[PDB]
Design a protein around this ligand. Structure first.
Ligand SMILES: NC(=O)c1ccc[n+]([C@@H]2O[C@H](COP(=O)([O-])OP(=O)(O)OC[C@H]3O[C@@H](n4cnc5c(N)ncnc54)[C@H](O)[C@@H]3O)[C@@H](O)[C@H]2O)c1
Ligand SMILES: NC(=O)c1ccc[n+]([C@@H]2O[C@H](COP(=O)([O-])OP(=O)(O)OC[C@H]3O[C@@H](n4cnc5c(N)ncnc54)[C@H](O)[C@@H]3O)[C@@H](O)[C@H]2O)c1
Ligand SMILES: NC(=O)c1ccc[n+]([C@@H]2O[C@H](COP(=O)([O-])OP(=O)(O)OC[C@H]3O[C@@H](n4cnc5c(N)ncnc54)[C@H](O)[C@@H]3O)[C@@H](O)[C@H]2O)c1
Ligand SMILES: NC(=O)c1ccc[n+]([C@@H]2O[C@H](COP(=O)([O-])OP(=O)(O)OC[C@H]3O[C@@H](n4cnc5c(N)ncnc54)[C@H](O)[C@@H]3O)[C@@H](O)[C@H]2O)c1
Ligand SMILES: NCCc1ccc(S(=O)(=O)F)cc1
Ligand SMILES: NCCc1ccc(S(=O)(=O)F)cc1
Ligand SMILES: NCCc1ccc(S(=O)(=O)F)cc1
Lengths: 334, 334, 334, 334
């Protein structure tokens, strides 16, 4: 029974909390978020504009978060080293604030008594990235701090692994059309720290170009593809669910139907739960609260010729990802 | 002539700048905003998601904001006391930060050398409030710090005035359906300071109830209506333009056509430039970049009977209000 | 047991089908829609942008629609007289096309062999209107064609009944902020048959004023309130969930706490499942797939004085109403 | 001086009309649209949710559209053979209904007396396609019926020309993130003809994959690139402005800065007015009402290697394309 701590009770923190509620092998025992009192915290957990209300009565008494019989400890500590994780026997800390993305910074959780840490984002430094279904078995129990990569990487890696393993990816460029994120502004304004100016432009009415190392990070989890992938993003006014568009060149030539079939037997076989497959005329809203990392859209993508393909895959960037964080938490503890 | 300073180069500050650019009787000489480098500030001014690109060249050299052939000074102080308005010879400071809405806080501009201050919002204390066309002539030149009220008050007040003058308002309740503002969040999160929980809810997908004092404020600029008006607001995913629905009970009976005509003659007579009138089948976007405070929508409202009415008026909550801040700045100086 | 047929398999058509799947006491045996082949119809039922995927597998075979051990006849006829409801043994026809809203038009369904008809919209003629919880017990089998009113009326009528019963309503005016509907247009264009020009304006970026008879229709189902209520609507870019904002004057004086408690009594007793009550800081998304006609929002509204109040109520215009249609269909058959 | 006729007074029809209002070299003398009364037609011309109010008074009298003082003839015909283009001395008809896209259909205008015709969309047959700046000089006056291609082709073709001219495109795949169009639905519903189910899915809340021939169409205007380019689209809830994202292999190797410099040089010289260049951190709203066909975004793209590039270009799909129709009209008349 993995004891999880959550630092940053935001989109991912709260949805990680929610996904653990249906998991026996993992339970959340402690939360930290200094920008939110207990009464406020309970409101944000109870109500969700995207994923609906919490499937359970959410109360607080005596400074605890009550989910029926379960009392969850709540802290409000800006300094992550002052969070008494070890007091609640926390096995793993889900680091979902977005501002401690370095081994030096994340390791402050260790000084508070947490055994291990997962960054809910790619690292700013050289912290081991792990993607469930792709390279998680290579994790070593003495690695105390790891990254679970981005939502976009969790989407592109399974697709790329399948395409590469069978046909061999020569080179690829990715576009992701990404749902709205908390680093964006409701109206034109200054981006946090004066970096990524476009992100501070009005979210409601703009297609917004964005940099992303998610495609390039696939080379970290799948070394074979080091130097063979990169990409960009475009932000759009969408609540959740994003889509990857991979234009790739392959070694062994194929028909699009053969590419689709290979992806289908991975989805039905060794990548069940991580990689999905569909042939339906789906749109983004059809993947809200889907827990897969990548759902391949057969009819959306296409082939220019025997070696040049456009491959389309969907992902609920909040929910798919939040599940993987649990999957990783359990794995690195067990 | 009038030399304007702007504290907070946000939605209002940048549009106060833009409007002042089109005027001869007033010029902006200084700007303060510590969350904005000079490069960033130029970019935010150059491009606008709502009101299009600034209609002039926007460059910078020597730490000065250049607008064609005019230097504007730029400061980056968090403490209004530390901004050297006096050297720039500022007559009025436009206090458009949202965080210095009392006489104690706003007076540090006067310490910095500025002659007078206009709060671009309702005050949190008993600072004098003025709405152009309603009570601005009652301005006393001894008053160095004033409020230009809210945008919603500037829309409602001219409507209530004309209606009250001719028919007498017994009592009124108001709803404003309001466009998106910078206090809102793109995704569900905790609102600043843990106040106004609903406003932290996803802006893109929700109708969000909001408290507003704008209808109570009409009682301050029109004392006769003190205690007779209040209301609420609903935030909606709209870039700009909001709408007031005033349900009022009148002492003197009238037909809807008589009420409409009275507003038409005010709009074309004494309140021209402040209050507008239309009988066209208009929608919110039709009032983007409309500089009027209030635009009565004749066909949108109706009457239940000879003393019970719903009166509908539009306002560009950004642009209309921004022009008023200039009108008031000129008035309190001249 | 109750055999329902549906005409117009749109937002209301499909969600009635959906609610009915959760119900044993009512079953959908037939469907008609001429703009929608059986393959296309299955796609539109399996996937919903607002309410999520259909709660079970959806296929078709031999011209029927399979939902487990169930088979639903599907027709594609523009003329309602040519749909064989009779051969399906249909008790009630859900008339949700939008275009057969008079007895003379709707009686075409009776010529097809159906026993009774519920118009899923307010009628354009003197057709009897019923609102569940308000006047439905006044129905008698005699009348073969009825109306379930509008979503808005199903929201307002319970609120108004309770307030009128306890305090007495003198006069009332209502604004509804309404979610988007299928009569609206994506880009500016001509409204259907030149009616309601405003509805033809871009739905994504506009607050759109609109007429409604929904408040005036309360006086049919509640004769007492005839001549005492009317109102208007503002359409906005929201998928589903709408809010009613009722300004009313009461005969007996009252504090807002007394008003709230009365609504809370009704919602917990006689109007359980029709009228709801909340004290939370809710936004529109919190009511998606909420099956109640009316959810009173205590903290959203307020009183100006002892006799003048603003009362705020939410409704899922799609789902709440779709369940009311089923309640009515059962009642007129039982 | 060139006299223009408009069949179909919709987004493209009305924006072509507006685009002509300013210009001296072309003039609209007659309009035809049967699904629109004159008064309604004046309403739709006067008000625009994207491009603001018509910059001139619009009225009608005696069945003439009056702009300022100028009388424009208005018709309501389903057979263009009956529209008196000849009487109005029309040099070119802008065919912008979307349903006369063959020689057989389009040639009814010629019997009506229109000297030439431009389809405001890709043809359903082998009608000669033209794109200004690209292959327009290969037009000869014997061709009376032509096509201005799509907005997407007009964005891509300029970018494809420059890159192919200097570096040689081996293969290319394109994504366009595209603004909402008239064929979309506000809420989930059946797309017309039963064609393209995804396009009937809710436009406000979805990323919607779409087919596009616009990348394959670049082979017709540039025979050298035939069979080398294809692509897909994603529709998103945006009022106007779209972006092309072209991934391609080049024959001759290059750095991104060299490629970017080559585009800049074409934008400043031979492709000025048609192709644009920027290194600013733009968002879609910055190109609303931009009359260029393609604006290259330098910072939004990147290179994987010396031969494999992602090139990004913006376009106001409404305004740029509309001005290109007029350009083509003037060209085919002179
Ligand atoms: N939302 C997504 O689409 C998504 C997907 C994958 C990864 N991520 C990553 O997960 C991280 C969180 O993203 P989010 O979308 O949940 O953002 P969010 O803004 O919703 O959550 C961040 C939370 O952390 C809290 N916080 C800030 N500083 C803190 C500190 N000092 N101590 C404790 N709490 C603090 C904030 O109050 C906030 O609630 C980011 O790094 C993001 O890149 C997000
Ligand atoms: N936006 C509207 O429709 C509207 C209408 C009328 C009035 N107002 C009022 O105007 C005020 C500003 O609102 P806005 O919409 O421009 O918000 P905004 O966020 O766009 O502007 C606030 C600006 O102030 C700056 N700022 C914050 N703290 C500062 C400080 N310490 N010193 C200097 N600058 C600081 C920020 O960087 C930001 O640029 C608010 O009080 C608001 O209620 C808004
Ligand atoms: N959507 C709401 O919020 C809501 C709420 C309450 C009541 N209603 C009412 O219900 C009715 C339907 O509304 P909707 O939202 O489902 O609209 P909708 O457009 O989604 O559904 C209408 C359906 O009827 C079909 N149709 C058209 N002509 C037909 C005919 N000749 N025969 C059979 N089918 C035909 C269309 O193909 C379409 O699928 C309307 O009258 C509306 O006012 C809607
Ligand atoms: N707006 C864009 O993003 C865009 C860009 C490039 C090309 N196009 C193309 O332009 C064409 C027009 O598209 P739109 O966006 O203007 O759509 P729209 O719906 O806004 O305009 C179509 C107009 O034609 C009228 N019409 C329909 N049938 C008619 C008939 N038979 N006779 C006369 N008028 C008729 C309608 O009343 C309507 O006003 C389409 O073929 C489209 O593919 C659109
Ligand atoms: N509080 C905002 C934290 C945050 C939230 C989301 C992101 S991202 O996943 O969009 F890059 C980044 C940072
Ligand atoms: N930076 C946030 C400042 C702010 C504060 C309040 C508003 S309001 O107009 O919604 F009251 C707008 C902007
Ligand atoms: N397909 C159009 C059917 C329709 C859909 C919605 C409405 S209304 O509820 O907005 F009045 C009316 C008619």
């Amino acid at each position: 029974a993995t004891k999880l701590g959550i630092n940053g009770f935001g989109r991912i923190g709260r949805l990680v909390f929610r996904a653990a509620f249906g998991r026996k092998d993992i339970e959340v025992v402690a939360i930290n978020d200094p920008f939110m009192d207990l009464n406020h915290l309970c409101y944000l957990l109870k109500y969700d504009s995207v994923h609906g209300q919490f499937p359970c009565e959410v109360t607080h008494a005596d400074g605890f978060l009550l989910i029926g019989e379960k009392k969850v400890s709540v802290f409000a500590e800006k300094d992550p080293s002052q969070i008494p994780w070890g007091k609640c026997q926390v096995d793993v800390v889900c680091e979902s604030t977005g501002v401690f993305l370095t081994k030096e910074l994340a390791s402050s959780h260790l000084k508070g008594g947490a055994k291990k840490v997962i960054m809910s984002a790619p690292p700013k430094d050289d912290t081991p990235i792990y993607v469930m279904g792709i390279n998680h078995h290579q994790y070593d129990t003495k690695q105390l701090i790891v990254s679970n990569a981005s939502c976009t990487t969790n989407c592109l890696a399974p697709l790329a692994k399948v395409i590469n393993d069978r046909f061999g990816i020569v080179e690829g460029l990715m576009t992701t059309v990404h749902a709205s994120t908390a680093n964006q502004l409701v109206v034109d304004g200054p981006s946090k720290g004066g970096k990524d100016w476009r992100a501070g432009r009005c979210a409601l009415s703009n297609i917004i170009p964005a940099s992303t190392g998610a495609a390039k990070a696939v080379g970290k989890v799948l070394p074979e593809l080091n130097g063979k992938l990169t990409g960009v993003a475009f932000r759009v006014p969408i609540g959740t669910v994003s889509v990857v568009d991979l234009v790739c060149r392959l070694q062994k030539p194929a028909k699009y139907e053969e590419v689709a079939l290979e992806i289908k037997k991975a989805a039905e076989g060794p990548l069940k739960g991580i990689l999905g497959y569909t042939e339906d005329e789906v749109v983004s809203q059809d993947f809200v609260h889907d827990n897969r990392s990548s759902i391949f859209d057969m009819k959306a993508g296409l082939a220019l010729n025997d070696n040049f393909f456009k491959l389309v895959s969907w992902y609920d960037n909040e929910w798919g990802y939040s599940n993987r964080v649990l999957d990783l938490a359990v794995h690195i503890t067990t």
